[PDB]
Design a protein around this ligand. Structure first.
Ligand code: AKG
Ligand code: AKG
Ligand code: FE2
Ligand code: FE2
Lengths: 341, 341
């Protein structure tokens, strides 16, 4: 019951296992599977209602994007600019650029490079043609600049289903759809979002490991003013148990998504996302929504995400009040040592 | 220059030393003297302006109370009720009774007993008449119930001088005058107030050891929701250097006040106050004032007292937001461990 993603699934038409376990990276912690359910299944509505993750196998959320692949996209996506992240390791740590002002003892290991889609397909082409070690990850918000066919594709997504979802959950407005295109083996390490997320897998296979918000103590997010806010400081490949002792208690929910699957990633759930090894390129489109309004007014006992939201707001104000985010830590220490520990 | 209170002072009319060093308790930390100045001395106005302590030797702030002693007071103070604190040790730790609700794993070592002045003089009389170990400390806000002569005494205090002080400093309104009557050897252990304080010594001799607000890290105040809020957790007689390691770095300002001296105790300065051993009873009246309005608006770098005020407000809100003061500590810990330490 520390199973993981379970035995792989059998493709339709006897096409053999979609993937196998040697495509999965190995970690220090155990996992239990996220349930794969039909969208008509009351249990799946239960999970989303309760803000627990679920993999919906038949939404058709992005049915028209299933034909997408690089040739189609290059052909049809337009000449807009695309954010492409670079890296020498498999782990793409994200940096918030606005936050980089107030941390100088920071340098990147992943640079954003703006480029046209064909330049991406191309940069992508040079690297394989020469066996390079390097890696790229395109991640760009879909918007109005995109070509006529992609727009027809987009309009054909299952808005009726996801709008009913937005409605039933009291969510706010859709903030963005991000288009993600990755190389095999790319990892987006563990982090959380403040939005609700339907994560709609289009091409290839991604393993998604989620941790609930009550595992905050085991995952050690960066300081809120740090550029890696909301990301774990823990290197999942080489965990430093002396700095991060509660990582030894972390327990995850795990699944592998393929073409057609939608993974509900609930607000504040940590997620770690890796494109299978030797699985080829992956494509995904996500759907971020604001999140229902905080109830006027509060009921106890608070949920884990609400305690998180509180920690963030304390860090933020202290940032403002002290005039400088760098003084947040010494102040907090002074506040607890010999007082609350 | 770790001098302390200096060589004792010589009473007028060759009456020999007012007190001597064997009347002073001994502690683990060093001290430098607080300056004793005349009220007309520009340097004394400098210190108060800068919120540094100073002992003013000639204010006449409470000239008419200098004749006070127990017989006079019993005779003249009326039949109102007087708060009298009790104790088996020399250290009178104060408890805030409103706060006792939310800490049950608390019992007192100092009970407030309401009683008439003559009952105090009397309880006081039984104990000496029989050589008891016990101790009392009367501490009661002067108010309208007091007898005609005490009121004449009070009206004769030097309002012209202290009102000019209130005015020059932009202080708010006088909140209370507390009347303190102690037995020789009584200690009010280290704590801070949020008000400004002119501490006006009337009978006997008190040693006052002050620490500036920037020594917060060395003095380990109780949690703000604890009943001993604003008091040091450190036992000055037996300091626990394992829980309170920064106590080994504490440095104090020290003085001995006698009849006629006024000690300015600035807002947020820690003070520890002991009535000299074998010095007899002490009498003091203080004058608490609100404190100038926080500037609209803030200028950096912040002063130590302002960082303190911030720590308090964080603890308070977290108290409110979590629904329970008991959860403040675990939350703060979760926030810093592996994150800010
Ligand atoms: O696919 C990825 O690697 C990133 C996905 C993600 O973090 C998200 O959709 O919130
Ligand atoms: O005289 C004492 O022991 C207490 C005085 C004091 O703490 C004050 O006036 O703020
Ligand atoms: Fe994410
Ligand atoms: Fe005090």
């Amino acid at each position: 019951v520390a199973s993981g993603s379970g035995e792989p699934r059998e493709e339709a038409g006897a096409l053999g296992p979609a993937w196998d376990e040697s495509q999965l990276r190995s970690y220090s912690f155990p996992t239990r599977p996220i349930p794969r359910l039909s969208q008509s299944d009351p249990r799946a509505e239960e999970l989303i209602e309760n803000e627990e993750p679920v993999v919906l196998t038949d939404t058709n959320l992005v049915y028209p994007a299933l034909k997408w692949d690089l040739e189609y996209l290059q052909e049809n996506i337009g000449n807009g600019d695309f954010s492409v992240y670079s890296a020498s390791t498999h782990k793409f740590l994200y940096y918030d650029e606005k936050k980089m002002a107030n941390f100088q003892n920071f340098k990147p290991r992943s640079n954003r490079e703006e480029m046209k889609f064909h330049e991406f397909v191309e940069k992508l082409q040079d690297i394989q043609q020469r066996g390079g070690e390097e890696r790229l990850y395109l991640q760009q918000t879909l918007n109005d600049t995109v070509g006529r066919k992609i727009v027809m594709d987009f309009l054909g997504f299952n808005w009726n289903w996801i709008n009913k979802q937005q409605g039933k959950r009291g969510w706010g407005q859709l903030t963005s759809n991000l288009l993600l295109i990755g190389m095999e083996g790319n990892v987006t390490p563990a982090h959380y979002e403040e939005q609700q997320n339907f994560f709609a897998q289009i091409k290839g296979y991604k393993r998604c490991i989620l941790f609930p918000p009550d595992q905050f103590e085991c995952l050690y997010p960066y300081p809120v003013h740090h550029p890696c806010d909301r990301q774990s400081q823990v290197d999942f490949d080489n965990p430093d148990y002396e700095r991060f002792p509660n990582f030894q208690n972390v327990v995850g929910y795990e699944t592998v998504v393929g073409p057609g699957d939608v993974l509900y990633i609930p607000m504040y759930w940590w997620h770690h996302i890796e494109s299978l090894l030797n699985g080829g390129i992956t494509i995904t489109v996500n759907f971020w929504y604001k999140g229902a309004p905080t109830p006027k007014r509060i009921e106890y006992p608070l949920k884990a995400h609400q305690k998180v939201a509180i920690m963030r707001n304390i860090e933020k104000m202290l940032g403002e009040a002290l005039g400088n985010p760098q003084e947040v830590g010494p102040l907090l220490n002074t506040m607890i040592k010999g007082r609350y520990n």
